[PDB]
Each structure stands twice: as structure tokens, then as C-alpha cells.
């Protein structure tokens, strides 16, 4: 019986034990999705990297044979997602409009603001006193506030858009997903319309001006790009901050090193990215045959990338299952690779460094406020992260 994919984690920062056979099937195995369909899983580092660079894999989920890992997804997959869900040459043209807003230089220039936002968040936690619920108090507002400012979406609407984002990603039913998407779409169409008559500051305003008013894009494409950036902007980073904190608290000795040597923080973020691999199960379909690792992925077969197992490939990383700040994590695929490699990674690094580093610098007593194995975390059919994170100090 193939391993069923995906499955819930049991320890939120490790691959599930049910993936043990995938660890031994490297670089490539087969797996069963929810409707019984059989597809390729990619489990080796070298093969992941080859394949994520191969224009013979498609990310367009509207293709007839594109794999669906949930019923919910199967239902919405008749609609394209801008950028992430588009192939070259169109992917390329979209990316180019966005890239200037997401440079390393832009990220470095935002750091003072990131630092101030984090300081204000930890200040409020400290004013209210422990315990705190770290996801809602910190891990979520930092990146939500930041992407709102960067995009020109008002953080004042965060309760609405965060709520709809959750329903959108998680459902659980088709109806929840369609309702969330409609509410978000209508919110974003109104926003864009408002911005057309009275421009603000923000990437969305730049896209309207420098793109739409050239005829280079339309409004639906903007809504799609805006949804993708708003959601990836806040969800991925919040999950990295919350799961990162949880992981660090459960590895006292690695945490103590970062405490002594804060200069390690960039390397720790990169290692936390590899070790946690929250964006697990990336989806493609072959549109032509691809020979790889001595077999052939054939046209129309589903291909799923088991990011977590890949980033624990010993060929990729010595002692891959150790959390370590000194063995390079460079070349991990937690931000993907090739064509769709994370647009927001420069920003995401600055956020995680500043947030995690300041958190532990400022609340040196920090610790879990409930038993570890009672703290809820997200299921395996979505991007991994804590749902809550009770802490004290
Ligand atoms: C820890 C934080 C993050 C992680 C782990 C993460 C992970 C990923 C991964 C794995 C991909 C590739 C998806 C695939 O190939 O199917 C991706 C793409 C993307 N990320 Fe992130 N990301 C993070 C933060 C962010 C942030 C802050 C943004 C901000 C807007 C963002 C925007 C995107 C976009 C737009 C893409 C699509 C790129 C393309 O299609 O060309 N990400 N990211
Ligand atoms: O999947 C959907 O229908 C919702 C949607 C709408 C617009 C843009 C992106 C997305 N979903 C979505 C997002 Cl929000 C982030 C990463 C990957 C995907 Cl498929
Ligand atoms: O990029 C894909 O193939 C879709 C996919 C599958 C599993 C896990 C994560 C992602 N994408 C995705 C990203 Cl890249 C950022 C935020 C939220 C989501 Cl759902």
C-alpha cells in the first residue's frame, strides 16, 4: 500500500513518522492522495532541485491532470492563481513587475520599521503581563502589519482579512472556501477601485499606476496577486515565528547558543527554515515526460514535493535531523527553488531574524505555558505552524 499523502505531523517541527518509508525511498516514490489517486513524491534534495527547475513541470492547477490533495482544493482549482499558479512566459512577466518591491535592499531598508513593530508588540505583551497567546499577540501581527504597509492594505481590516484567509486556506468545506474567497475578492475589488480614484502608497498602488494604467494587467489579476501576497505575506511568516519559537523552546541547548552569540541569528533562521519546512507538499504536474533518478515521470502524472523529507536528505545535509547552527543550511528548499522560488524570502528573513531574536533578547525567561504536546498546530493538508502558542516569562 503506498503511503497516503499528506498526513498530520505528530511533532510539529518533524516530518510525520508515517513518512518513514519516504525517507527510505529517496529520491522518488509514489504516494496516494485523498481520492486514492497515485502520484509521484519527490523526496531527494538533488532531484527536488532538478525538478523544480524543469519547465516540463507546470504549476497551473487548472490543467486536467493537476493533482489535488484535498476535496476543497479540487473544487477551487478551476481558477488560476496569478504568479505562483502560472507558467513562463506569463510567470516571468508577472514576477518582473513585483521583483523591485522585494529586493534584499528593500528588505534591509525595512528593518528599522520591522524592529519598531516587534518592539511595540513585545511592549504590549509586557504591559498586559504574562501569560500570552503568542500567535495572536506577536507571530501574526508582525508580518500582517508589515505586508499591509508594503501592499497598501489597511491593517485596520486585519480581523476581516485574517479571518477570511484562514477559511480560504483551511475550509473545511467547499462552501467556507467559496464564501471566504468571495468576501476577500469583493474587499479587494473595492480597494483597488478606491485606489484608482485616490492613489495611496503601496505596491498595489504601484501596480495600478505602472501596470494597469499601461494596460499591462487587469483587475482580476491584481486581486489574485493581492490575495496571494497578503496571505503568503502573513501566514508563512507567522507560522515560522510561532513554530520557530516552539522549536527553539524545545531545544534548550541550541537556544542557549543563540542567546550567547546573537550573531548566529541569520544562520539560525536559515536552519529553522530547513528543519521546519512548513510549506510541505508543493504541487506540480508533468506536461511532458521527464527522465530522472533512472525512472520516467510521464506527461500528466502528479508530482508532489515532500519539502520536509527533502530537507532531511543526508545527501543534502550532514546529520540532517539535527538542529544545528554551524553546518550550513544553504541550498534547503523550504523557500522552493527555480521558477517559483519565494519572492518574499528577503523580507521573510528580516522578519524572522528580528522577531525571534528580539523576542528571546527581551523575554529571557520565555517558556511554554502549557504542556508541549497539548499545544495545537495545523493539520497536514495545509502550511504547517502553531494555531496557538501559550507562553510565559
Ligand atoms: C517563512 C516564510 C516563507 C516561506 C517558508 C515561504 C515559502 C515559499 C515556498 C516554498 C514557495 C514556492 C512555492 C512553490 O514552488 O509551489 C514560495 C513562493 C512564494 N512566496 Fe514565499 N515563503 C515565505 C514567505 C513569504 C513572504 C513574506 C511573502 C510575501 C509576500 C511570500 C511570497 C511568495 C510568493 C509571491 C511566492 C510565489 C513566487 C513565484 O511564483 O514566482 N513568501 N514561498
Ligand atoms: O486557492 C485559492 O483559490 C485561493 C487563492 C486566491 C488567490 C491567490 C492565491 C490563492 N490561494 C493560495 C494562496 Cl492564498 C497562497 C499560496 C498558494 C495558493 Cl493556491
Ligand atoms: O506552492 C504550492 O505548490 C502550493 C502549496 C502546497 C503545500 C504547501 C504550501 C503551498 N503554498 C503556499 C505558499 Cl508557497 C505560501 C503560503 C501558503 C501556501 Cl498554501
From Swiss-Prot:
User: Which residues make up the binding site for heme?
Assistant: 342
Q: Which reaction does it catalyse?
A: 1-deoxypentalenate + reduced 2[4Fe-4S]-[ferredoxin] + O2 + 2 H(+) = pentalenate + oxidized 2[4Fe-4S]-[ferredoxin] + H2O
Q: In which pathway does it act?
A: Antibiotic biosynthesis; neopentalenolactone biosynthesis
A Gene Ontology annotation in the biological process aspect, one of them, is: antibiotic biosynthetic process
Instruction: Please name the InterPro entries in this protein's record.
Output: Cyt_P450, Cyt_P450_B, Cyt_P450_CS, Cyt_P450_sf
> What GO molecular function annotation could you give as one example from this UniProt entry?
heme binding
Which residue intervals make up region (Disordered)? Answer: 1-19
Entry keyword set? Antibiotic biosynthesis, Heme, Iron, Metal-binding, Monooxygenase, Oxidoreductase
Q: Which cofactor does it need?
A: heme
EC main class here is oxidoreductase
Q: What is this protein called?
A: Pentalenic acid synthase
Q: What is the lineage of its organism?
A: Bacteria, Bacillati, Actinomycetota, Actinomycetes, Kitasatosporales
Amino acid at each position: 500500500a503506498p503511503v497516503a499523502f499528506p498526513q498530520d505531523r505528530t511533532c510539529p517541527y518533524d516530518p510525520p513518522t508515517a513518512y518513514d518509508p519516504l525517507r527510505e525511498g529517496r529520491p522518488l516514490s509514489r504516494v496516494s492522495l485523498y481520492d486514492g489517486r497515485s502520484v509521484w513524491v519527490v523526496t531527494g534534495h538533488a532531484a527536488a532541485r532538478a525538478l523544480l527547475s524543469d519547465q516540463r513541470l507546470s504549476s497551473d492547477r487548472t490543467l486536467p491532470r493537476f493533482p489535488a490533495t484535498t476535496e476543497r482544493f479540487e473544487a477551487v482549482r478551476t481558477r488560476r492563481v496569478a504568479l505562483l499558479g502560472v507558467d513562463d512566459p506569463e510567470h516571468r512577466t508577472q514576477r518582473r513587475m513585483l521583483v523591485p518591491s522585494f529586493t534584499l535592499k528593500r528588505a534591509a531598508a525595512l528593518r528599522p520599521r520591522i524592529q519598531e513593530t516587534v518592539d511595540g508588540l513585545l511592549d504590549a505583551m509586557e504591559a498586559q503581563g504574562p501569560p500570552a497567546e503568542l500567535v495572536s499577540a506577536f507571530a501574526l501581527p508582525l508580518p500582517s502589519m508589515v505586508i499591509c504597509a508594503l501592499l497598501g492594505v489597511p491593517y485596520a481590516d486585519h480581523d476581516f482579512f485574517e479571518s477570511q484567509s484562514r477559511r480560504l486556506l483551511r475550509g473545511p468545506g467547499i462552501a467556507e472556501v467559496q464564501d471566504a474567497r468571495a468576501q476577500l475578492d469583493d474587499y479587494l475589488y473595492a480597494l483597488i477601485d478606491r485606489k484608482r480614484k485616490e492613489p495611496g502608497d503601496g505596491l498595489l498602488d504601484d501596480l495600478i499606476q505602472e501596470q494597469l494604467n499601461r494596460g499591462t494587467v487587469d483587475r482580476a489579476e491584481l486581486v489574485s496577486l493581492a490575495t496571494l501576497l497578503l496571505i503568503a505575506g502573513h501566514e508563512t511568516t507567522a507560522n515560522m515565528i510561532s513554530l520557530g519559537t516552539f522549536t527553539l523552546l524545545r531545544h534548550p541547548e541550541q537556544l542557549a547558543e543563540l542567546r550567547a552569540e546573537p550573531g548566529l541569528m541569520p544562520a539560525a533562521v536559515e536552519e529553522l527554515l530547513r528543519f521546519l519546512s512548513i510549506a510541505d507538499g508543493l504541487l506540480r504536474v508533468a506536461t511532458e515526460d521527464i527522465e530522472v533518478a533512472g525512472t520516467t515521470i510521464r506527461a500528466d502524472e502528479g508530482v508532489v514535493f515532500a519539502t520536509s523529507v527533502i530537507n532531511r536528505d543526508a545527501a543534502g545535509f550532514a546529520e540532517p535531523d539535527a538542529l544545528d547552527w554551524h553546518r550550513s543550511a544553504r541550498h534547503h528548499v523550504a523557500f522552493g527553488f527555480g521558477i517559483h522560488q519565494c519572492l518574499g524570502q528577503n523580507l521573510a528573513r528580516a522578519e524572522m531574524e528580528i522577531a525571534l531574536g528580539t523576542l528571546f533578547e527581551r523575554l529571557p525567561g520565555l517558556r511554554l505555558a502549557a504542556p508541549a504536546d497539548e499545544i495545537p498546530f495545523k493539520p497536514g493538508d495545509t502550511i504547517q505552524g502553531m494555531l496557538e502558542l501559550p507562553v510565559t516569562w
